[PDB]
Amino acid sequence: EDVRFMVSLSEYGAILSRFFEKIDFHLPKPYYDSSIEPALAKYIEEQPWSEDLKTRAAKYAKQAVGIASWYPRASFAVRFNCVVITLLVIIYDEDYLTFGDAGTEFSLRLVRGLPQKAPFLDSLAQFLQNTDQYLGPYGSSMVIKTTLEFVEGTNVENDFSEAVPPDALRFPRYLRVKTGFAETYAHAIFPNDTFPEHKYRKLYLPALSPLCDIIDFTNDILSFYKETIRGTERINYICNVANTTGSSALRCLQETVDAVESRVLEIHRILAPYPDLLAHCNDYLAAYIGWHIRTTSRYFLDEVRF
Amino acid sequence: EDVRFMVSLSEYGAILSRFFEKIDFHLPKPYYDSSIEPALAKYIEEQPWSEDLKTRAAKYAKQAVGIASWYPRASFAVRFNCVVITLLVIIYDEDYLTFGDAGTEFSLRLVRGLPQKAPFLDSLAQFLQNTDQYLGPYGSSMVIKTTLEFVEGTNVENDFSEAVPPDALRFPRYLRVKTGFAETYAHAIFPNDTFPEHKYRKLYLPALSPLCDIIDFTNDILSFYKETIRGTERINYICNVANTTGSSALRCLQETVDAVESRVLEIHRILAPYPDLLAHCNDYLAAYIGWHIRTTSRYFLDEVRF
Amino acid sequence: EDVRFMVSLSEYGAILSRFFEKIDFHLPKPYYDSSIEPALAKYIEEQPWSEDLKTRAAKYAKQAVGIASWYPRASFAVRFNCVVITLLVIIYDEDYLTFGDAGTEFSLRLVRGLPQKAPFLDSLAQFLQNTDQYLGPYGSSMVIKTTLEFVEGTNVENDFSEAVPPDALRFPRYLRVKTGFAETYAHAIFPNDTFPEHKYRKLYLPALSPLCDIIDFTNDILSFYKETIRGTERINYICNVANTTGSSALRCLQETVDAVESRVLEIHRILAPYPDLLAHCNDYLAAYIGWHIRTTSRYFLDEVRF
Amino acid sequence: EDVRFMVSLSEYGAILSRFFEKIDFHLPKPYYDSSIEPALAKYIEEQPWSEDLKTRAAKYAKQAVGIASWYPRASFAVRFNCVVITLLVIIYDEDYLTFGDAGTEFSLRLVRGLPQKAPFLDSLAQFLQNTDQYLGPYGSSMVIKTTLEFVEGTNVENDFSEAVPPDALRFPRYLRVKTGFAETYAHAIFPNDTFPEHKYRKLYLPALSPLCDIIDFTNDILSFYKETIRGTERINYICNVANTTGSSALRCLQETVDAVESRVLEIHRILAPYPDLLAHCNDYLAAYIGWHIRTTSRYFLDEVRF
Ligand SMILES: [Mg+2]
Ligand SMILES: [Mg+2]
Ligand SMILES: [Mg+2]
Ligand SMILES: [Mg+2]
Ligand SMILES: [Mg+2]
Ligand SMILES: [Mg+2]
Ligand SMILES: [Mg+2]
Ligand SMILES: [Mg+2]
Ligand SMILES: [Mg+2]
Ligand SMILES: [Mg+2]
Ligand SMILES: [Mg+2]
Ligand SMILES: [Mg+2]
């Protein structure tokens, strides 16, 4: 028990309320694409996964299918590929320990062109091998490099528990880059069929970093309840910042809220001359937050007033 | 011509003088290891490169061999591998245009385990496959993902000349992460044979992010002369910051000097309980700066008074 | 009733426990000085006060004599003067209403050299006129100006009740400067005999603002029980912060605890090259807390477990 | 020479431009009152000052008469008294050394009812004795205590030169409170003849503190050129903040502009239900900035383009 990490249910609901007023967020109408869930089921049936892993995936696939709502104007290939990678990332985020050390050999086996040590990781390598179905060469490289960071970040996150963040540093943002997986989702905001890199990458690339900040930090704000209030996670971004600035988690929550609103403003500026790019950005962000609110099985936000 | 980007020899010389005094930099005594240059020449002989590539590589090898001085306490495996990857990185930094679009296929061919479209990129892929000789699995992952960024950053850097950077963003730091290659050199500061990741990674990882800031920004300060005063490069970190904050390049240089100083302080705070880790950092930074000064064929700092 | 201002006995005791080991507070041995009690008794006898006021002053003098323990290594003149002004400040804090509007005339009659409208305020003017017995000119000016603030802050404090601090401002800290009387006690930490101003004022002045924050806030922390849990005061600093930030009084208590710890660290850094000055601060803070705990007749902290 | 304090003329003009557009500053129409200057001249004739001091005063009186414009709605008693105290404060700000140690004895002689050691300080004592012509009792106390702070802050400011503010953080604001004289001007924004304290003090007092920040910080921003770029003052607020946080004066100026905008918003929120009180604040701030711009003999801002 440390008061530093304690945020009351009323305090958190207030933070969320303030957040949504600041960015003028309104809950979109429910998004439905009836092809997504059957296609994801077919994907799972096709993997050379144990029956136990497939049974687990059913619980995680119900959450992954809503990721298609993040890209409502994108092609099916974009939306379905993002849902597939979301299923994979969710499985590893929750169950990385069940794969033993297979996750630690992933990067070397990948660049050696070796079979992976776990069939789940073969599925992930194959996803990496085929991102050219919806992204250009810059984005494919970024999806690969971000995946390697996420796998290692997931494996080492908890090494910093038991209070092993040092008190004076910039480590929380570094680690959050590694855990967040943001560039993979950010690049699909600007798909290569609609926005071929050769013509558009120069226009949208300057907005990529503030977009990634929004992706990482908005999840930190919206999942603080399931991670730290309701849960036992004390090595997420918010708690890492609290431990390295001395501040309460409540203040770091409010600081993160303000940083997101600042990033939202700057993306509006950057993409103001190009309303097609900016319209994909706006659709992503509203659905991203709405997915966090509606996926109560993962984030439990129906236990909060905001 | 524009006044914002011009920096007199006298102004640049003074910035370097106050930078060196502020971080208490002294030129280390020269480092000599008689095995490095023959080993690198043997490496170049063994690559199935064209005779023209081997002739250029002989030139860059004379600049590359000095990187062994950055890790004087480390094994030969650390020092030589860092020299090899430095040779390859200088080749690509200088000559990326001569490989055509082979660099843009590098990441997908890498993870598909296929031959590269240029033998130079095969040599790069083989280096990524073998970092386990001196690094642990986290460090190997980070060398791979950094190399993927460096190739793509070098390929797209100049898309942003001709006044492509919009005037309001986080983009310069984003792009310098990609172009800088910092994590590969930072991870060698803490080699796996001396500092097995299982025991030491949790102790030095909080220091990695400010170290990369130091590596990237210190090159930005010390290579500004050859890039922008002596040369025509206006898409580097300094000029990108100037174009997105409204400041002169002189001001952006001074701010970057201040940032490096702040990072130097915070790494000293982080690593004070671990003097072996701090010693490796101190060896690196003195030699890192000294190499920039001494390699006049690349940075021309003997034309500056400081 | 409103939940926003409710703090339970176990909640408050836990906050106090959290405060004390955060600053490494250990209760000092009882401080005894045989000459303080009789000297204060003679001062009360000599004042041309009514018998009713002298009877009141005898009650408050039992609480006031403990202030000499705040300056254990100071001259008798420092300890006794601090005790006398403490007696006067307690009389006004408790009984300002019994003087009618005499206190509102205090400052203009003072600077006009005129008789005050109540003998009690003549004694207060007389104290302000003799601070050169233990302070230099800067300290004497700060005791005068702080007394003027304290009289007026006490007079207008309760104008802000029944809810009329508007809910978005920095007014709480402003009003607390007025009501707290902190600079008078802070300047006696550095008395002019031991630390003459011409040499020492430039050394200890940078620590005065964080000292005043510690003095003010620490009373806010430790007197919250008698004021708001045990009593009816809802216009103190903690309640004012709660009413202008929308936070619970409980949260505002914790924020103020974190603030005091931050000031303690700041003063330890500032006065590190002057450990004699720091020693006087450490003696002050320990006895200041101890006096709050021991003076149960004013703060009732023997009704709390911590 | 120290780059820490160096701001170029282009950089400073851009800060002022950003500052003015951020608070929507427009230069008010010139304010003229034919009675102000003759009355101030008469006041100066009546003073028992040496002919030298009276001659010196002519230079400062021409600057002081502009202060009536800060209170365009207020009575003559407000505008004229503010001009008089401005004359005395400007004389002491520039010429405090010419009075020897008379300023150090000011506060004790004042509260002892003694004649002051210099005729100039008798005039200052008399002003403090007669503020009831336009202020109520809280305002009168605040003008007295602010005057004592200003006299002492001017006397000891330069003791912190030769680089002796240490590197911790609350000291610059502490010293600026002392030197700024802000409360005396802020109280006249809500004068007792227009806004009798009995009815309005509870309404405007919550805006006093952000007002005082605006008065102190706006001078710091608009007088940085005469003090530090053109001048030799390195103990003002901006330089003191730069020495305690490590930042450049350029960064500290931007931070201060941001704080002023924040205070302006907060005051608009506080006084929104009372547009008459808000109107007096808007008139004050516009004419306060305008007087800085127009008083070129003191601030030299006609040498800056903004
Ligand atoms: Mg995770
Ligand atoms: Mg997670
Ligand atoms: Mg999360
Ligand atoms: Mg280069
Ligand atoms: Mg490069
Ligand atoms: Mg460079
Ligand atoms: Mg009180
Ligand atoms: Mg009280
Ligand atoms: Mg109290
Ligand atoms: Mg001044
Ligand atoms: Mg001045
Ligand atoms: Mg000034």
Side-chain angles (χ1 to χ4, degrees):
Chain A
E1 262 207 2
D2 199 22
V3 201
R4 146 179 291 154
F5 306 114
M6 290 176 52
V7 172
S8 87
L9 254 288
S10 206
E11 288 168 346
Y12 182 68
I15 286 175
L16 258 50
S17 275
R18 249 33 191 271
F19 180 18
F20 296 156
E21 329 175 64
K22 283 223 163 332
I23 68 172
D24 197 29
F25 162 77
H26 303 3
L27 192 61
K29 40 198 271 214
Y31 169 96
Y32 212 61
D33 176 60
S34 281
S35 70
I36 289 296
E37 191 163 12
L40 189 54
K42 196 186 156 195
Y43 171 86
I44 287 158
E45 312 164 32
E46 289 174 341
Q47 301 310 303
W49 295 354
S50 77
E51 272 292 275
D52 176 45
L53 182 52
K54 294 204 180 140
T55 308
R56 295 166 174 169
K59 157 230 279 193
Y60 300 137
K62 282 293 198 190
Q63 298 152 0
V65 285
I67 264 55
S69 81
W70 301 359
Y71 312 99
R73 279 132 173 270
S75 64
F76 172 88
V78 170
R79 285 178 294 147
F80 178 68
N81 276 290
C82 292
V83 161
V84 160
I85 190 54
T86 299
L87 170 71
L88 299 189
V89 156
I90 290 177
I91 285 173
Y92 202 68
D93 206 55
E94 306 298 325
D95 303 326
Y96 67 103
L97 283 182
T98 72
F99 300 106
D101 62 0
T104 71
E105 332 198 303
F106 177 78
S107 62
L108 267 186
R109 286 182 180 248
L110 189 68
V111 304
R112 278 160 188 190
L114 303 180
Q116 293 283 334
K117 214 198 207 183
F120 167 85
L121 295 174
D122 285 315
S123 296
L124 183 57
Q126 287 185 286
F127 181 89
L128 298 187
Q129 291 160 353
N130 289 283
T131 57
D132 63 333
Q133 318 264 15
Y134 71 106
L135 299 167
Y138 189 97
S140 288
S141 295
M142 296 311 120
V143 167
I144 290 156
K145 78 100 196 167
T146 301
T147 298
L148 303 173
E149 286 182 319
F150 163 75
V151 169
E152 271 312 291
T154 301
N155 294 344
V156 315
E157 247 173 328
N158 289 104
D159 290 25
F160 299 95
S161 74
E162 194 55 279
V164 195
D167 320 64
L169 43 69
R170 318 170 102 73
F171 169 64
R173 191 58 200 108
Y174 162 94
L175 187 59
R176 188 43 171 168
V177 166
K178 310 280 189 219
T179 66
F181 202 67
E183 273 160 278
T184 296
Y185 294 122
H187 277 280
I189 297 175
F190 311 111
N192 194 48
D193 39 34
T194 310
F195 301 117
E197 288 188 358
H198 335 282
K199 162 150 91 103
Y200 290 91
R201 186 187 56 222
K202 88 204 324 309
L203 306 178
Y204 65 70
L205 216 67
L208 250 279
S209 171
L211 273 170
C212 290
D213 293 341
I214 293 171
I215 296 173
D216 289 347
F217 293 161
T218 299
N219 172 268
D220 291 307
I221 293 158
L222 296 185
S223 73
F224 184 77
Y225 177 77
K226 71 98 163 162
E227 296 176 339
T228 300
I229 297 178
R230 190 182 196 279
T232 74
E233 183 169 337
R234 305 297 188 264
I235 46 89
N236 52 22
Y237 176 71
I238 293 301
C239 292
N240 290 347
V241 169
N243 277 128
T244 69
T245 66
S247 309
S248 67
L250 183 60
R251 180 214 278 268
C252 302
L253 271 169
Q254 180 60 236
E255 269 151 28
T256 310
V257 160
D258 309 320
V260 168
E261 156 68 334
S262 156
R263 305 297 190 288
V264 161
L265 185 42
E266 151 192 345
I267 273 154
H268 278 3
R269 271 106 181 239
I270 292 164
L271 297 180
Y274 326 98
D276 39 340
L277 302 160
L278 181 120
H280 282 77
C281 273
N282 292 325
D283 297 340
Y284 176 96
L285 172 59
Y288 185 72
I289 296 172
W291 176 84
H292 275 89
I293 287 160
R294 282 163 197 291
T295 309
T296 55
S297 61
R298 192 172 176 76
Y299 301 109
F300 297 86
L301 287 180
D302 60 344
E303 302 175 358
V304 188
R305 326 198 187 177
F306 54 85
Chain B
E1 267 192 5
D2 212 12
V3 123
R4 319 216 264 102
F5 299 102
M6 67 172 72
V7 173
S8 75
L9 204 85
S10 182
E11 286 166 337
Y12 185 71
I15 278 178
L16 262 47
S17 282
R18 71 182 99 267
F19 177 36
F20 292 158
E21 189 286 323
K22 201 33 62 198
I23 65 178
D24 194 29
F25 161 77
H26 317 309
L27 194 53
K29 325 173 329 207
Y31 176 86
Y32 182 59
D33 190 346
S34 63
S35 302
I36 293 295
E37 188 41 290
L40 191 58
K42 162 183 63 44
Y43 174 85
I44 297 179
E45 291 167 33
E46 292 177 348
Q47 304 315 293
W49 293 354
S50 60
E51 217 47 69
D52 289 8
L53 183 46
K54 291 189 179 202
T55 301
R56 284 269 255 170
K59 179 210 178 113
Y60 302 142
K62 94 211 168 284
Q63 317 176 329
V65 288
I67 269 67
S69 78
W70 300 359
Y71 315 94
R73 295 185 194 238
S75 69
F76 177 83
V78 174
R79 277 172 279 126
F80 183 57
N81 270 114
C82 289
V83 164
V84 159
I85 194 49
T86 298
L87 173 66
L88 308 188
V89 155
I90 288 172
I91 284 166
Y92 206 70
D93 205 63
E94 298 297 311
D95 300 324
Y96 66 102
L97 292 178
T98 66
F99 308 105
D101 54 356
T104 68
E105 284 179 59
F106 175 77
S107 65
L108 277 182
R109 293 182 163 279
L110 183 64
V111 297
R112 290 169 181 177
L114 301 173
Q116 292 293 330
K117 280 297 202 135
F120 166 79
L121 293 172
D122 280 332
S123 306
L124 182 58
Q126 270 145 220
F127 176 91
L128 297 183
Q129 292 164 358
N130 288 282
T131 50
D132 59 336
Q133 294 179 331
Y134 65 103
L135 292 175
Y138 188 94
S140 296
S141 299
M142 299 297 128
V143 168
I144 289 155
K145 80 97 201 171
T146 300
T147 301
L148 292 174
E149 290 169 316
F150 166 78
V151 174
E152 275 309 293
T154 303
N155 285 346
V156 310
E157 230 168 346
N158 292 95
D159 297 1
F160 297 98
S161 91
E162 193 69 277
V164 179
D167 30 298
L169 42 61
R170 326 281 196 222
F171 176 64
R173 189 71 199 91
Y174 166 92
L175 184 59
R176 188 47 170 169
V177 165
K178 309 297 192 228
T179 63
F181 205 64
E183 265 159 291
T184 298
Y185 291 117
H187 269 286
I189 300 182
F190 316 111
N192 193 51
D193 35 11
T194 319
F195 301 119
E197 281 196 4
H198 144 75
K199 163 180 210 209
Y200 287 89
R201 186 180 63 221
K202 69 143 80 171
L203 309 182
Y204 63 67
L205 224 60
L208 275 191
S209 172
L211 275 171
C212 298
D213 284 354
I214 287 177
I215 292 160
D216 278 357
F217 290 159
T218 298
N219 170 268
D220 283 310
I221 293 153
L222 301 176
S223 67
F224 189 78
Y225 177 64
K226 73 103 166 165
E227 286 172 2
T228 307
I229 298 168
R230 202 184 176 277
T232 55
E233 182 181 329
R234 305 273 146 51
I235 43 85
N236 53 11
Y237 172 81
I238 298 296
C239 291
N240 296 342
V241 175
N243 275 319
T244 64
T245 62
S247 311
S248 65
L250 190 68
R251 179 55 73 176
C252 298
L253 279 170
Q254 187 49 237
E255 295 171 3
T256 302
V257 170
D258 292 329
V260 165
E261 173 36 16
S262 152
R263 304 300 194 292
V264 163
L265 265 39
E266 84 152 84
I267 279 149
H268 274 59
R269 278 191 289 267
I270 287 164
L271 295 186
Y274 318 104
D276 36 355
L277 304 176
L278 195 32
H280 283 57
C281 291
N282 291 338
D283 290 350
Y284 177 95
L285 180 50
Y288 184 69
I289 303 175
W291 175 84
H292 275 89
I293 292 153
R294 266 152 186 169
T295 313
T296 48
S297 62
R298 187 175 181 72
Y299 302 107
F300 300 89
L301 290 182
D302 61 338
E303 301 171 10
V304 186
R305 299 147 184 138
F306 55 88
Chain C
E1 267 198 6
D2 201 77
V3 152
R4 151 145 84 192
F5 293 102
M6 297 175 62
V7 180
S8 74
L9 200 88
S10 49
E11 279 171 343
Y12 183 70
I15 270 157
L16 252 46
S17 300
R18 256 281 83 201
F19 178 32
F20 287 162
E21 86 301 29
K22 221 192 174 106
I23 67 173
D24 201 42
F25 165 75
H26 295 285
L27 179 74
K29 202 277 260 185
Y31 175 87
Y32 186 58
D33 188 12
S34 318
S35 73
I36 297 288
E37 269 256 353
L40 194 50
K42 320 198 134 92
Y43 174 88
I44 286 150
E45 281 198 289
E46 274 168 51
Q47 298 314 293
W49 294 349
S50 69
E51 272 336 304
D52 287 357
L53 184 47
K54 280 169 160 131
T55 305
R56 268 317 182 284
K59 176 209 175 104
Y60 300 144
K62 302 342 163 213
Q63 317 177 334
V65 286
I67 267 58
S69 84
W70 301 0
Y71 313 95
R73 289 139 205 214
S75 71
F76 179 81
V78 177
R79 275 170 306 148
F80 181 60
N81 273 271
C82 287
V83 167
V84 163
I85 191 52
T86 296
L87 176 68
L88 307 183
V89 157
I90 288 171
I91 291 180
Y92 206 69
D93 208 61
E94 303 300 306
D95 296 325
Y96 61 104
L97 290 179
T98 73
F99 300 111
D101 63 19
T104 74
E105 276 177 71
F106 174 76
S107 68
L108 277 184
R109 291 188 161 276
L110 183 62
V111 299
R112 288 168 177 176
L114 288 186
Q116 292 287 338
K117 271 320 214 137
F120 166 81
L121 295 165
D122 280 328
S123 307
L124 183 57
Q126 271 161 29
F127 178 90
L128 294 184
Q129 296 166 350
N130 290 80
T131 48
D132 50 355
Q133 292 302 324
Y134 69 107
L135 299 170
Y138 191 102
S140 296
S141 308
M142 293 317 143
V143 169
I144 291 152
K145 82 94 191 172
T146 300
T147 303
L148 295 179
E149 285 175 319
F150 166 80
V151 173
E152 271 314 285
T154 300
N155 285 352
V156 309
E157 228 165 351
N158 291 99
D159 297 4
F160 296 97
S161 87
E162 193 57 296
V164 69
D167 41 276
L169 40 70
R170 320 173 104 69
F171 172 67
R173 185 76 202 85
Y174 162 95
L175 188 57
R176 187 47 165 165
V177 169
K178 303 298 185 238
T179 67
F181 203 67
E183 278 166 273
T184 301
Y185 292 125
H187 275 281
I189 295 181
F190 310 117
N192 197 53
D193 36 36
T194 293
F195 311 107
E197 282 189 6
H198 54 233
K199 190 170 135 101
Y200 285 94
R201 183 180 57 220
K202 96 197 269 187
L203 306 175
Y204 63 69
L205 240 66
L208 274 184
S209 180
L211 277 166
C212 289
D213 287 344
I214 289 159
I215 293 163
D216 279 354
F217 292 161
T218 299
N219 173 267
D220 285 316
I221 294 158
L222 300 177
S223 64
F224 186 80
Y225 180 66
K226 70 103 165 160
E227 291 173 4
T228 306
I229 303 172
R230 203 191 180 280
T232 58
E233 177 172 337
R234 299 289 218 270
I235 45 86
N236 52 16
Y237 173 72
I238 296 290
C239 288
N240 295 339
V241 176
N243 272 325
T244 69
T245 64
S247 298
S248 74
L250 183 68
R251 179 53 79 174
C252 298
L253 277 176
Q254 188 60 56
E255 297 157 52
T256 306
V257 167
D258 298 335
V260 166
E261 154 73 350
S262 172
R263 308 294 186 290
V264 160
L265 309 193
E266 176 169 326
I267 285 162
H268 289 346
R269 284 186 200 101
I270 290 164
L271 296 181
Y274 323 104
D276 41 315
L277 300 165
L278 186 49
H280 277 247
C281 301
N282 281 338
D283 293 348
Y284 179 93
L285 184 45
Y288 185 75
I289 318 285
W291 176 85
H292 275 86
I293 292 155
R294 255 135 192 186
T295 310
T296 51
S297 62
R298 196 173 176 67
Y299 300 106
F300 304 92
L301 294 179
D302 64 333
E303 302 170 3
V304 177
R305 282 178 245 264
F306 53 83
Chain D
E1 261 208 10
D2 203 19
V3 299
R4 165 120 63 179
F5 303 124
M6 286 166 102
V7 181
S8 77
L9 191 66
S10 268
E11 285 168 348
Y12 183 65
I15 292 154
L16 261 52
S17 279
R18 179 241 217 173
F19 175 44
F20 290 163
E21 74 168 283
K22 216 150 40 56
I23 67 176
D24 194 28
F25 165 71
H26 303 291
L27 195 69
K29 238 163 181 277
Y31 173 92
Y32 182 37
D33 194 339
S34 326
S35 56
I36 287 299
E37 195 157 358
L40 188 59
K42 192 192 180 184
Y43 171 90
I44 291 161
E45 330 163 11
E46 268 152 66
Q47 296 315 293
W49 298 353
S50 78
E51 274 285 282
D52 183 58
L53 181 50
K54 270 180 201 198
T55 306
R56 281 140 64 179
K59 174 199 170 116
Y60 302 137
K62 186 65 66 162
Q63 303 167 339
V65 282
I67 267 61
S69 73
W70 304 358
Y71 312 100
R73 313 285 81 166
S75 65
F76 180 84
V78 173
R79 289 169 295 149
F80 177 66
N81 271 277
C82 289
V83 167
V84 167
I85 191 54
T86 299
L87 172 60
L88 310 181
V89 152
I90 290 172
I91 291 172
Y92 202 73
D93 202 66
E94 298 303 315
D95 299 334
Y96 66 101
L97 287 179
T98 69
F99 305 108
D101 60 15
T104 67
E105 318 199 10
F106 178 76
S107 66
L108 274 175
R109 291 189 186 229
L110 188 67
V111 307
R112 285 165 180 176
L114 312 183
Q116 296 285 340
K117 259 183 85 184
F120 169 84
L121 288 179
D122 283 309
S123 308
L124 182 56
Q126 275 185 315
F127 181 90
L128 293 181
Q129 291 168 346
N130 299 113
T131 51
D132 48 356
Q133 318 277 337
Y134 69 107
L135 296 175
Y138 189 101
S140 288
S141 302
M142 292 321 129
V143 176
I144 289 157
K145 75 99 203 181
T146 301
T147 298
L148 308 179
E149 278 180 320
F150 162 79
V151 170
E152 277 304 312
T154 298
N155 290 352
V156 315
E157 254 176 326
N158 291 103
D159 306 351
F160 301 96
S161 91
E162 203 52 279
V164 82
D167 335 314
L169 318 165
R170 272 105 201 167
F171 173 65
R173 186 65 199 117
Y174 163 92
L175 190 55
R176 189 47 172 161
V177 164
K178 304 292 186 232
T179 64
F181 200 62
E183 269 166 279
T184 296
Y185 291 117
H187 273 282
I189 296 182
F190 310 107
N192 192 51
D193 46 21
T194 301
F195 300 115
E197 282 192 359
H198 165 253
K199 150 150 180 93
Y200 296 92
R201 195 190 42 225
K202 80 200 298 258
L203 306 175
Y204 65 72
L205 220 71
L208 272 190
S209 179
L211 269 175
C212 281
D213 291 344
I214 291 174
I215 291 153
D216 285 345
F217 290 167
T218 301
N219 175 266
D220 283 315
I221 292 161
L222 301 181
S223 65
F224 189 76
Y225 178 67
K226 70 96 164 163
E227 291 174 0
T228 301
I229 298 182
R230 200 195 173 257
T232 57
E233 190 181 329
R234 308 283 186 276
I235 46 83
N236 49 8
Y237 177 76
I238 295 298
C239 288
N240 291 342
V241 171
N243 275 323
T244 61
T245 68
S247 303
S248 64
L250 189 61
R251 193 136 190 212
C252 297
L253 281 169
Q254 318 244 60
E255 277 159 23
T256 305
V257 167
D258 291 344
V260 166
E261 147 179 81
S262 172
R263 308 292 183 283
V264 165
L265 294 213
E266 164 174 347
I267 278 165
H268 205 267
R269 290 181 254 118
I270 285 157
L271 292 185
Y274 321 104
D276 40 354
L277 302 164
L278 187 55
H280 277 82
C281 302
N282 295 335
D283 294 345
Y284 180 93
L285 186 43
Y288 181 76
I289 300 169
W291 176 89
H292 274 83
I293 291 174
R294 297 192 161 119
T295 310
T296 59
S297 53
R298 193 177 173 68
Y299 300 106
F300 304 82
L301 289 179
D302 59 348
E303 300 174 4
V304 185
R305 27 186 52 159
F306 52 82

